[PDB]
RNA sequence: GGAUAGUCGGGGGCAUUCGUAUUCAAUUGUCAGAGGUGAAAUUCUUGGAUUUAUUGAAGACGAACUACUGCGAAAGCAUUUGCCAAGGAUGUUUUCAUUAAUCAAGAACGAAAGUUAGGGGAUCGAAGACGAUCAGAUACCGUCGUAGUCUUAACCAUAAACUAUGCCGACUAGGGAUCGGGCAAUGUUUCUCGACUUGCUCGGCACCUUACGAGAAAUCAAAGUCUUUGGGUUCC
RNA sequence: GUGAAGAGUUUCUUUACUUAAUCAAUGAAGCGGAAUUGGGAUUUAUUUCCCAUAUUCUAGCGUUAAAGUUUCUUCGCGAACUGAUCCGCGUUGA
RNA sequence: AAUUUUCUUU
């Protein structure tokens, strides 16, 4: 039993992906890297390549401390929004798996509403 | 069963006493089984009536509703403060 | 500016004695210095961990319990029961079309100061010979089912305390009793406690933790 | 005879002070000069004296109640009484 | 029409209970971007943004279950429980006995938006402010944002308020689903009842095929029973 | 005035005390600490870690002491203790 | 994203 378990939150939005890694508790986190600091184009923040770059950078910084296994928890925008994880969620999962860090207890913790407040758009909606 | 219907059928077939002075007279004479006290009663009068019923071994029911509600339940157009059921008739008020 | 990891220490987390495991994981707390106590900054932490991990059996994988770290004993923090819930994947899988879902709740009290709002959810089931695909129950039957769940919860939780509450939630006796009591009504299926919430807590049980712990 | 289409009690004010101000005063004075029921006697004999004091006559229950400016009870006070009642029950239990 | 028995209903009102989500507030952890978009851009962030973790408050709404399914005269009605009044269908060798149908005039309710005073104002968001697109964008796009969106006491009184199809009554072709009730099964199942299966019937929501029939046709079990033109009655 | 931490033979910052000094209340009317007292967990338990309150009432009254062991000697509405635990560097609070 | 206009007839 020489394994150390952390908690890796993934926030897979359609605009930018968050790869947050903390300890087994909630506070006193170690690593937080997104696609914004991996690509500077302001367009490919949610790209799978940028998500995997952030995920592997998080893996390297976690291996620096010496933590082996992570309990993964992916989550979309949630609330009164799309509620669908972006393309970077699977890219981050594969990057963590490929980096050699152990993965356990996959779960989706996107915040769902019980018929929450009105969504923006104005009835007719975003007529783009 | 409810008590308003029971009170109504005691009114149809039973013996009732209205007011405070007559209720005290009935309790004093001992021909009393149940007394009904409205929620709007004076506290001193309620304590006196409870003491009278305890002395005479008569049951007390301080039902909800004002004296207006008690009179409406009794079927009268005036306010009723204290009810004294002397004969239940064919009911189970007591 | 220096490395922020030089002011951090690793401590073990000990789940309460109700479970089948002792070591759950490790935490992270900043360096203990003056005017700021690691003990003061540690007691406000919440952990989530799977009941399968706590029981060394995959029979409770969908269930996940939360613990509240309260006491520190020899650089090994001790936690207490804080609630149980069901995974989103399990809940979405359980929820299905062309069936009736009945969910109820009740607040319970233990022998000591403890207010627990426990929920329960149950779904209608087919009889392996039904030809139709509706399988719906009337609202009167739903209300009768809710009354049966209320009676079962009250009877089984009249005097248990938290020890018996944990000892009876793992084998799922509440759902079994609800299904047994619902024999005269729609058979019902997948009856389980979806979430238990904790509203009041005792005076830290500073001595009862010593009473329960101290073994192995 | 109706004797007044809409002004009612504000007919003493004639044509001055404005219609909206007269209407607001009319509502206030209608509330102010109203007989209310004693919550202890059940008689519609409660009348206002000096903006916050309400008294009912009779042989009994000569109590003097502290109420609103022109109503015996205000909505805010009733809400506060319910809130205090709720808090007291939670503290006791 | 009324009564009676078991039911049924997301029908109405009052009181009560619960749920996550949104916003905000306090506190804790590392640091450089975060939002947003086709692309961006406004804005704020080494004074700690965003995220993660704990606690609390506010208001709104009852996701999934949720359906060619239910209720109400319609507008509409979807968290738990209790109370009150009322309602349709069903069962009935119960009661009255024509009490009936449709309506001028006159009245009740009447989504949303709009008005007058009180409370509350989380989210969204008319007006508006900026920032991108365009030749000009005054709009569609992003952020903020007043009235409004909630509620009480008074108002009005209209929507593609639609089934673009008035109400009552009789008849008319084959079948299968669904809701509520009732009847029948020496039917099945689970520690006298429920669930499921089959058949019959009444009252609804609808569906498939067809056209004896209708229409100018699209189509219609009524929009059929109309040159073979007449059951009754309003609106237009 | 008195002390504790951080710092390039010395005092910059914050962070503790009250008697200086300031404010408020009052008839400067009960501030603080000790012994039993029953729950309480240290535990083949020891006040060792914990602090506990008498008046909810209905528009009544509540004062000039009663009761107690025991002292003249029991002429006494006599003198003391207690009833009303003891103690004190602070009238109370900011 | 972005795409406005085609006089009166033969
Ligand atoms: Zn009075």
Curated annotation (Swiss-Prot), chain A:
SUPFAM superfamilies: Translational machinery components (SSF53137). Keywords: Cytoplasm, Nucleus, Ribonucleoprotein, Ribosomal protein. GO terms for molecular function: structural constituent of ribosome. GO terms for biological process: cytoplasmic translation; ribosomal small subunit assembly; translation. PANTHER family: 40S RIBOSOMAL PROTEIN S14/30S RIBOSOMAL PROTEIN S11 (PTHR11759). This is Small ribosomal subunit protein uS11B. One of its GO terms (cellular component) is cytosolic small ribosomal subunit. Component of the small ribosomal subunit (SSU). Mature yeast ribosomes consist of a small (40S) and a large (60S) subunit. The 40S small subunit contains 1 molecule of ribosomal RNA (18S rRNA) and at least 33 different proteins. The large 60S subunit contains 3 rRNA molecules (25S, 5.8S and 5S rRNA) and at least 46 different proteins. uS11 interacts with eS1 forming part of the mRNA exit tunnel. uS11 interacts with snoRNA U3. uS11 interacts with MPP10. Component of the ribosomal small subunit (SSU) processome composed of at least 40 protein subunits and snoRNA U3. Signal peptide: none annotated.
UniProtKB/Swiss-Prot annotation, chain B:
It is found in: Cytoplasm. GO terms for biological process: cytoplasmic translation; negative regulation of gene expression; rRNA processing. The keyword Metal-binding does not apply. PANTHER family: RIBOSOMAL PROTEIN L30. Belongs to the eukaryotic ribosomal protein eL30 family. There are 2 genes for eL30 in S.pombe. This is Large ribosomal subunit protein eL30A.
Curated annotation (Swiss-Prot), chain C:
GO terms for molecular function: structural constituent of ribosome. GO terms for biological process: cytoplasmic translation; ribosome biogenesis. Keywords: Acetylation, Cytoplasm, Phosphoprotein, Ribonucleoprotein, Ribosomal protein. It is found in: Cytoplasm. It holds the Pfam family Ribosomal_S3Ae. The keyword Lipid biosynthesis does not apply. One of its GO terms (cellular component) is cytosol. InterPro entries: Ribosomal_eS1, Ribosomal_eS1_CS, Ribosomal_eS1_euk. Belongs to the eukaryotic ribosomal protein eS1 family. There are 2 genes for eS1 in S.pombe. PANTHER family: 40S RIBOSOMAL PROTEIN S3A. Component of the small ribosomal subunit (SSU). Mature yeast ribosomes consist of a small (40S) and a large (60S) subunit. The 40S small subunit contains 1 molecule of ribosomal RNA (18S rRNA) and at least 33 different proteins. The large 60S subunit contains 3 rRNA molecules (25S, 5.8S and 5S rRNA) and at least 46 different proteins. eS1 interacts directly with uS11 and eS26, which form part of the mRNA exit tunnel. This is Small ribosomal subunit protein eS1B.
From Swiss-Prot, chain D:
Gene3D superfamilies: 2.20.25.30. This is Large ribosomal subunit protein eL43A. GO terms for cellular component: cytosol; cytosolic large ribosomal subunit. It comes from Schizosaccharomyces pombe (strain 972 / ATCC 24843). The keyword Ribosomal protein applies. NCBIfam families: eL43_euk_arch. There are 2 genes for eL43 in S.pombe. Component of the large ribosomal subunit (LSU). Mature yeast ribosomes consist of a small (40S) and a large (60S) subunit. The 40S small subunit contains 1 molecule of ribosomal RNA (18S rRNA) and at least 33 different proteins. The large 60S subunit contains 3 rRNA molecules (25S, 5.8S and 5S rRNA) and at least 46 different proteins. The keyword Zinc applies. A zinc finger (C4-type) spans 38-61. Component of the ribosome, a large ribonucleoprotein complex responsible for the synthesis of proteins in the cell. The small ribosomal subunit (SSU) binds messenger RNAs (mRNAs) and translates the encoded message by selecting cognate aminoacyl-transfer RNA (tRNA) molecules. The large subunit (LSU) contains the ribosomal catalytic site termed the peptidyl transferase center (PTC), which catalyzes the formation of peptide bonds, thereby polymerizing the amino acids delivered by tRNAs into a polypeptide chain. Belongs to the eukaryotic ribosomal protein eL43 family. Keywords: Cytoplasm, Metal-binding, Ribonucleoprotein, Ribosomal protein, Zinc, Zinc-finger. It is found in: Cytoplasm. It comes from the Eukaryota. Its main location: cytoplasm. One of its GO terms (molecular function) is zinc ion binding.
């Amino acid at each position: 039993g020489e394994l150390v378990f952390g908690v890796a939150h993934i926030f897979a939005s359609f605009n930018d992906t968050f790869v947050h890694i903390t300890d087994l508790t909630g506070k006193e986190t170690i690593v937080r890297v997104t696609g914004g600091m991996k690509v500077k184009t302001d367009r490919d923040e949610s790209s799978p390549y940028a998500a995997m770059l952030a995920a592997q950078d998080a893996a390297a910084k976690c291996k620096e401390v010496g933590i082996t296994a992570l309990h993964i928890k992916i989550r979309a925008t949630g609330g009164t929004a799309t509620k669908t994880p972006g393309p970077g969620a699977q890219a981050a999962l594969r990057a963590l798996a490929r980096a050699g860090m152990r993965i356990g207890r996959i779960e989706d913790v996107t915040p769902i509403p019980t018929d929450s407040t009105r969504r923006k758009g104005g009835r007719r909606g975003r007529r783009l | 069963d409810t008590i308003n219907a029971k009170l109504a059928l005691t009114m149809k077939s039973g013996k009732y006493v209205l007011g405070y002075k007559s209720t005290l007279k009935t309790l004093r004479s001992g021909k009393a089984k149940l007394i009904l006290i409205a929620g709007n009663c004076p506290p001193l009068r309620k304590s006196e009536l409870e003491y009278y019923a305890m002395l005479s071994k008569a049951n007390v029911h301080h039902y909800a509703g004002t004296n207006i509600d008690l009179g409406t339940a009794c079927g009268k157009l005036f306010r009723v403060g204290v009810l004294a059921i002397t004969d239940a008739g064919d009911s189970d008020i007591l | 500016v220096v490395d922020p990891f030089s002011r951090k220490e690793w401590y073990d987390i000990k789940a309460p004695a109700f479970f089948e495991v002792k070591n759950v994981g490790k935490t992270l707390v900043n360096r203990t210095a003056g005017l700021k106590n690691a003990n003061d900054s540690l007691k406000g932490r919440i952990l989530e961990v799977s009941l399968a991990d706590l029981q060394k059996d995959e029979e409770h994988a969908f269930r996940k319990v939360k613990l509240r770290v309260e006491d520190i004993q020899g650089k090994s923090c001790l936690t207490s029961f804080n609630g149980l819930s069901i995974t989103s994947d399990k809940l979405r899988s359980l929820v299905r079309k062309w069936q009736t879902t009945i969910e109820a709740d009740q607040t319970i009290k233990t022998t000591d100061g403890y207010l627990c709002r426990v929920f329960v959810i149950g779904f209608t089931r087919r009889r392996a010979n039904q030809v139709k695909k509706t399988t719906y129950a009337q609202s009167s039957q739903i209300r009768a089912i809710r009354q049966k769940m209320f009676q079962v919860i009250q009877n089984q939780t009249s005097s248990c305390s938290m020890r018996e509450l944990v000892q009876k939630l793992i084998p799922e006796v509440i759902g079994r009793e609800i299904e047994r009591a619902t024999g005269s009504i729609f058979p019902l299926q997948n009856v389980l406690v979806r979430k238990v919430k904790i509203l009041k807590a005792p005076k830290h049980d500073a001595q009862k933790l010593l009473e329960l712990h101290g073994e192995s | 005879t109706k004797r007044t289409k809409k002004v009612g009690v504000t007919g003493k004010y004639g044509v001055r002070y404005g219609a909206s101000l007269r209407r607001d005063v009319r509502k206030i004075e209608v509330q102010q000069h109203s007989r209310y029921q004693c919550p202890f006697c059940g008689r519609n004999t409660v009348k206002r004296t000096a903006a916050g004091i309400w008294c009912c006559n009779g042989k009994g229950c000569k109590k003097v109640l502290a109420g609103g400016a022109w109503t015996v009870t205000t909505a805010a006070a009733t809400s506060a009484r319910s809130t205090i009642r709720r808090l007291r029950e939670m503290v006791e239990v």
